[PDB]
A paper describes a structure:
MAb3 is constructed on a human IgG4 S228P/kappa backbone and is an affinity-matured version of mAb1, differing by eight amino acids in the heavy chain (HC) variable domain, with identical light chain (LC) variable domains. Despite these differences, all three mAbs share the same epitope, leading to identical interactions with hArg1. MAbs1-3 have prolonged HC CDR-3 loops that extend toward the opening of the hArg1 active site. Inactivation of hArg1 is achieved by the presence of Tyr104 that inserts into and sterically blocks the hArg1 active site near the exterior surface of the enzyme. While mAb1, mAb2, and mAb3 utilize Tyr104, the subsequent Arg105 of these mAbs is also near the active site opening but does not access the narrow channel as seen with mAb4. MAb3’s binding to trimeric hArg1 was quite potent (KD = 0.74 nM), but there was no measurable binding between mAb3 and monomeric hArg1.
Numbering used by the authors:
A (entry chain A): 3 to 319
B (entry chain I), C (entry chain E): 1 to 214
D (entry chain D): 1 to 227
E (entry chain G): 1 to 151
Write the structure that this text describes.
Amino acid sequence: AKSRTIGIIGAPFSKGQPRGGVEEGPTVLRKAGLLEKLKEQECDVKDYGDLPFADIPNDSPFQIVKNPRSVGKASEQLAGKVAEVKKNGRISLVLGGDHSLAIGSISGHARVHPDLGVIWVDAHTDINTPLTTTSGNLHGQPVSFLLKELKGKIPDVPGFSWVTPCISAKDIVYIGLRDVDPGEHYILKTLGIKYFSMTEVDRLGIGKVMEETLSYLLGRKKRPIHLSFDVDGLDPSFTPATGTPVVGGLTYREGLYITEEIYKTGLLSGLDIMEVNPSLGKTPEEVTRTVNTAVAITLACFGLAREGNHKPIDYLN
Amino acid sequence: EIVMTQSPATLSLSPGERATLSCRASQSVSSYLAWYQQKPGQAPRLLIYDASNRATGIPARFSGSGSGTDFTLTISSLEPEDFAVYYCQQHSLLPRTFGGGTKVEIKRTVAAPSVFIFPPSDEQLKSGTASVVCLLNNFYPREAKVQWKVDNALQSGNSQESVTEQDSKDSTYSLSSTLTLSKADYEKHKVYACEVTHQGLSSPVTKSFNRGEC
Amino acid sequence: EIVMTQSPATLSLSPGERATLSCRASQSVSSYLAWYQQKPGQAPRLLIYDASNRATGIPARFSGSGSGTDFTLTISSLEPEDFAVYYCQQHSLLPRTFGGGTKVEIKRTVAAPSVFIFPPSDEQLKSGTASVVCLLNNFYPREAKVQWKVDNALQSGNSQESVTEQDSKDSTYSLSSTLTLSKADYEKHKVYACEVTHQGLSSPVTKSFNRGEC
Amino acid sequence: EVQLVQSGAEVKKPGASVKVSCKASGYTFFKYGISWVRQAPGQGLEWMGSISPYTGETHYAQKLQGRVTMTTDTSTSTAYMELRSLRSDDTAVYYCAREGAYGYRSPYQNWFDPWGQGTLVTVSSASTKGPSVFPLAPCSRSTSESTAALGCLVKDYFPEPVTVSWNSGALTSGVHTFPAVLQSSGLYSLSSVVTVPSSSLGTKTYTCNVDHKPSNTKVDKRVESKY
Amino acid sequence: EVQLVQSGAEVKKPGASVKVSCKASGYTFFKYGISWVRQAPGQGLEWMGSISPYTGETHYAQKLQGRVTMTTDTSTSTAYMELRSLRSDDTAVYYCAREGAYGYRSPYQNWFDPWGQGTLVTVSSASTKGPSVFPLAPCSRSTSESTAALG
Ligand SMILES: [Mn+2]
């Protein structure tokens, strides 16, 4: 169909976060066999392989921001690949990896659809600047490069000269905030970005939150929706093998309801699955649950309803 | 559990030019490991923190490269205070494997051990035991042998050796195999020879005595 | 951990009529176990999948019953290609216990082993060891004994035996206890007798030599 | 057909794992839960673990919980099973097979029929060595016996196997290959192949051609009388 | 400076733990995940566990899971590590050091630079005894040699 027409982009990338091991994100998810789990239902599955990311040894850092240039080269390569696969009319499934990849993901998606919107599901806002950071890790700084309102507030980071800020403060909705920096919360209150922390989800319920989210983004104008997802926004009871484990996250049922409502919009146009670290699994059972969680999220993004799904023909024959 | 293999096992260099060291990883660490300065009897000290970039007061000469399997550690301007066991250690994978050990020695020349066997004391015969101590002293390198001879019987297992550190002064070494016996097995024999085979020695030097001689 | 006890330990049958086999469970499996065909040196093969019903290309003769403690496996029309170790195995309880082993032999008659002791080679005396090898050959069944005699000293522990499979041709067996000694204990004695006690033998056959005879 | 390609026969001393590719073929994956079963030679079988193919439910057996790790590779339907802190008890032919998944949509199986062919794993601290054959192939005239037998003494090899043939496989009659009875001394198993010639064959030499290819060693022998 | 005061050198026979105060100083806590590493003398080092300072994430290493317990004392920034059912393998100088917390707000470290000075722990069932010195210090005239040694 128009929905569940998939270009698969694997990015075995880790250089925007400290703990190496999310390079085996697409490796484990492909050996979890997301492709075959799509191929039952009417999915136009087409992988495009993994991207060859060069290793620049002289990736000289910024003041606090470390590894700018290899990350910028990675996201520029990924922006080309995402724009390429969205020329195909597919839905850009990109998965890594960490949030630094989402820069080029949203970039190449905005090259095709400049009118997009972002649902950034994450424990964090990841809205840090090079100035307002504490770690300098670019997986904590993807969003600030992509916001038009932080133009001039973004320093000239080596490797991100190609980056064009493509969305506005109204173009993005956060869901799942429970680990927010004072700089992050100050910027969030500064730009007036619509968000949904764990407080409002516990207040309204996940149905009312998803209702208000789709009313905010698609109630004005039906536009392509780029769900960019972090696994730590779900509770680490389900996803302990994530890079930034923060307790008190969303439930597995809640995330499945989110992705089912996104599929029932049908305006999903790009999916980003990051922070998948099998090396942070204390048991392989932890890895197994986390990977199955991410796969089931992706399947419910591409039509796997919990109520059941069938090919529209008679079965009583 | 990425195995870190340091390609120089040990090293000996009379103080001088580039004394570059090497460590290899079992996987791709990708510039995410560090270099260390475990001095003898001391706490280790950070040399390089991420494959380069010369951590926080390192003087002038301790660069390194890598990215991302086999890493280097350049000791370019040797400075003989820097004689210490060095360590690569991966970090960005759990669990966090160290390297093997990079004991940096001094390469003076190969010298001969001044070999001195010592009878056990009669005070040790008052203790009901006997430990025969065969010196090696003031030599280079540590590559030596001790073959105990008990009325010329090639014995071991009753013998514990003891390796000095390399001296700051004359860069030498000193060994002592300690042929700890019972008093009963001591009284069974007299000719207590100590066949010492070292590179500085031209011959396997057998230093001997008789039980009751000295 | 339901113990599966196979009531025939082994079986020997010259090829013929019903050769029905049995396995008992420690609990009530209730028709939820399977039958298997581990051939020698081979992967096992499914015979019966749920207590009956003759799985997927089994020829004509391999029914079974049960339901639900003591199960049967009927080898009705023997077909001597089917000589293999058979297995009941419960499935619908964890963990999934197998049976014991149902080595199906052939029952020709009880024959006598042609017993042949062999001195160690002088090449083994060049190796500093000695292994005396006492044959048994072309007999039935495996129920045998070897009593080594070292200047007529009943020894064991220095001896490893070796059991051939039952031959397809003559259904026989062959043994070899290997009295592996030191060369020193070899040189202590000459009369190296091998008291072999088998059912086909009328007597305990003592096959001997002298050290340096052959 | 519904088949398994196991790979491959490998030994470790006490060390790291012998993770086996259990390559599935012919039948669809994610519907058919694959197990693993060890069997020491001359012993009964021991089921030791079984994943569900998708949503991997481990179900490791008793006494190794723990030491075993099993993974799935449903890109290309191979499966895997490791071991941790390997040990001399792990001298066993490891079979993978398929229980069938006990989910809801999986079809009914209980009986292990993809069967894997087996994988030789002996955990072993011996070093790879050729045999030290200490034969006797005399001229059937030891004392007086007509059908006097002869046989070589295939001693102290590792790993398995030796390949022994009499006179490049000429003498096939009387061949009774004794299995690799394993030394407790150095884990160097012992075998022998014997034949029974007659005393009217005294002008014939007989060469056991003992060829131990995992050490790439080839041994040819004969022994005569003593004047 | 960024320093660690370890305390203190202690032996146990096979018995209870040798819980070491790893007193941090000079640098702020709850931002800097502190590890522990054992090293037997004449041996390589073995990292054995590392807590996050706040929201203590244990990350105990292989072969002792189990026997180790690590705690935090961020009133005064000392840390602790015990052992259970002590054993003669535990003849090792225990170093505490700091990985740096792998949270979100913690700054980037991977390299263990508070370094602790070490702690002598040998697990040991011997009793406290003076030496039994059985000397020879002769008058360098044993048989004939000029520079005759003594010890
Ligand atoms: Mn995030």
